[PDB]
C-alpha cells in the first residue's frame, strides 16, 4: 500500500520540491506514493503520511533506493540552502544565494556534478519554482549557469509539468466539489 503525499494548492510557498521528489519516485517505482490534494491556506504545505515536519527529507530517506546519488552531507547542504534560503522572498539574500548556486554550476550540469541529477537539484529547482522573485535576479545578475540548469530541468516533464499537474488536479477537485 503506497505512502500518501498531500500537496496543498493554497500554500503560499507551494511544495514543488516534495511533489517532484514523489514524481521521481513513482517514475522509477510506480505506485510508491499516492498523491492527495488539499486547497486550504490553513493546512500544511505538504504531509507525508502523518508527518508535517521535514517532509522533503522524509521522502528522500524513505525512498533511499531512488535517491541514491550524492554524499549525504553534500546533499544536505544544498537541500538546506533550498529550504532555508532559496524560498525566501528577500532580494539581497536571494541574490547572494543565487550567486552561490551559480558558482557551483559553473563547471557542472547538476549541483553535485553527476551524470544524473540528485535530491540537491530537486530541492533547489522546487524552491526556485515556488519563488517568483528569482526570475529577474537570475537574469539581471547574469546567473547564467542557474538559468541554463533551470531550463534543462524544466524541459524534463517530471519537473516542468509539476505545476500543470497540480493546477489541473486542483481544477478537477473544484469541478468535483461543484457537481450537482
From Swiss-Prot:
Query: Record's superkingdom?
Result: Eukaryota
- Annotated coiled-coil positions are none
What does the UniProt function comment say about this protein? Catalyzes the attachment of glutamate to tRNA(Glu) in a two-step reaction: glutamate is first activated by ATP to form Glu-AMP and then transferred to the acceptor end of tRNA(Glu). In mitochondria, constitutes the nondiscriminating glutamyl-tRNA synthase that generates the mitochondrial mischarged glutamyl-tRNA(Gln) substrate for the tRNA-dependent amidotransferase (AdT), which generates mitochondrial glutaminyl-tRNA(Gln) by transamidation of glutamyl-tRNA(Gln).
Q: Which family does it belong to?
A: Belongs to the class-I aminoacyl-tRNA synthetase family. Glutamate--tRNA ligase type 2 subfamily.
Query: Extra info from the record?
Result: Present with 48700 molecules/cell in log phase SD medium.
Quaternary organization: Component of a yeast aminoacyl-tRNA synthase (aaRS) complex formed by methionyl-tRNA synthase MES1, glutamyl-tRNA synthase GUS1 and the tRNA aminoacylation cofactor ARC1 in a stoichiometric complex. Interacts (via N-ter) with ARC1 (via N-ter). Can also form a stable binary complex with ARC1 that is functional in terms of aminoacylation. ARC1 increases the affinity for cognate tRNAs due to the presence of a tRNA binding domain in the middle and C-terminal part of ARC1.
Q: Where in the cell is it found?
A: Cytoplasm; Mitochondrion
Q: Which organism is it from?
A: Saccharomyces cerevisiae (strain ATCC 204508 / S288c)
Name of the protein in question: Glutamate--tRNA ligase, cytoplasmic
Q: Which gene encodes it?
A: GUS1
In this chain, the stretch annotated as Interaction with ARC1 covers 106-115, 141-157
Amino acid at each position: 500500500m503506497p505512502s500518501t503525499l498531500t500537496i496543498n494548492g493554497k500554500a503560499p510557498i507551494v511544495a514543488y520540491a516534495e511533489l517532484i521528489a514523489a514524481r521521481i519516485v513513482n517514475a522509477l517505482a510506480p505506485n510508491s506514493i499516492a498523491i492527495k490534494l488539499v486547497d486550504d491556506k490553513k493546512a500544511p504545505a505538504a504531509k507525508l503520511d502523518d508527518a508535517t515536519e521535514d517532509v522533503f527529507n522524509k521522502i528522500t530517506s524513505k525512498f533511499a533506493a531512488i535517491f541514491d546519488n550524492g554524499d549525504k552531507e553534500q546533499v544536505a547542504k544544498w537541500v538546506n540552502l533550498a529550504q532555508k534560503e532559496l524560498v525566501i522572498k528577500n532580494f539581497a539574500k536571494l541574490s547572494q544565494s543565487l550567486e552561490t548556486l551559480d558558482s557551483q554550476l559553473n563547471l557542472r550540469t547538476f549541483i553535485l556534478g553527476g551524470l544524473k541529477y540528485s535530491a540537491a537539484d530537486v530541492a533547489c529547482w522546487g524552491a526556485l519554482r515556488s519563488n517568483g522573485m528569482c526570475g529577474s535576479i537570475i537574469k539581471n545578475k547574469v546567473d547564467v549557469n542557474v538559468s541554463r540548469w533551470y531550463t534543462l530541468l524544466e524541459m524534463d516533464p517530471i519537473f516542468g509539468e509539476a505545476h500543470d499537474f497540480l493546477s489541473k488536479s486542483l481544477l478537477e477537485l473544484k469541478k468535483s466539489a461543484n457537481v450537482g
